[PDB]
């Protein structure tokens, strides 16, 4: 197991840029930026395959949320089956995040609860929109994270923490 998904890429990020970025973690087997079949438009993500699993782990541990062409990358172990992303089991939503909190800070704090598959502070032109997500490997980790962190002050601003809800599910419950 030595394949990383590298997402949230700027459309103009190339394979070469990714090699330059990831190469210091150790020798690379191959790198593929995924593209639309005919127009070749980047799909906003890539696979980076290391020769050594320890090297892939180092890169994930060390280079996550680093900026390439002005946008922080989001690295995961490759998991092409989207069923867990779809089910949201273990996935949590955080709101009223002070704008001083970035991806790395959110990751460092929440990883105390358990191993994180993926997390993200959402950003636009003005920076953090003040909300984000953290998807834990286990649902027990998510539950502890919610129980502990909901209603807490994070850098002086009170957060909501709760199970992630998809747009359809949320518009259902709000009516």
């Amino acid at each position: 197991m030595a394949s990383l998904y590298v997402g949230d890429l700027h459309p103009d990020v190339t394979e070469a840029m990714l090699y330059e970025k990831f190469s210091p973690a150790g020798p690379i087997l191959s790198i593929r930026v995924c593209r639309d079949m005919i127009t070749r438009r980047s799909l906003g993500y890539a696979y980076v395959n290391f020769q050594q699993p320890a090297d892939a782990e180092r890169a994930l541990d060390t280079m996550n949320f680093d900026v390439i062409k002005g946008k922080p990358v989001r690295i995961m172990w490759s998991q092409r089956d989207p069923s867990l992303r779809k089910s949201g089991v273990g996935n949590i939503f955080i709101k009223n995040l002070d704008k001083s909190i970035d991806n790395k800070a959110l990751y460092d704090t929440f990883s105390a609860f358990g191993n994180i598959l993926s997390c993200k502070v959402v950003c636009d032109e003005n920076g953090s929109k003040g909300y984000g997500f953290v998807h834990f490997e286990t649902q027990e980790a998510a539950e502890r994270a919610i129980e502990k962190m909901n209603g807490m002050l994070l850098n002086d601003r009170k957060v909501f923490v709760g199970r992630f809800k998809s747009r359809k599910e949320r518009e259902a419950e709000l009516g």
Binding site: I101, T109, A112, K148, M152, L153, L154, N155, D156
Partner: peptide, 20 residues
């Protein structure tokens, strides 16, 4: 980095407790 304070403990910083 992120500082965690608890409103139901008068806003006491509990950042170290949470991490362990």
């Amino acid at each position: 980095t992120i500082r965690i304070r608890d409103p139901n403990q008068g806003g006491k910083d509990i950042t170290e407790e949470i991490m362990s």
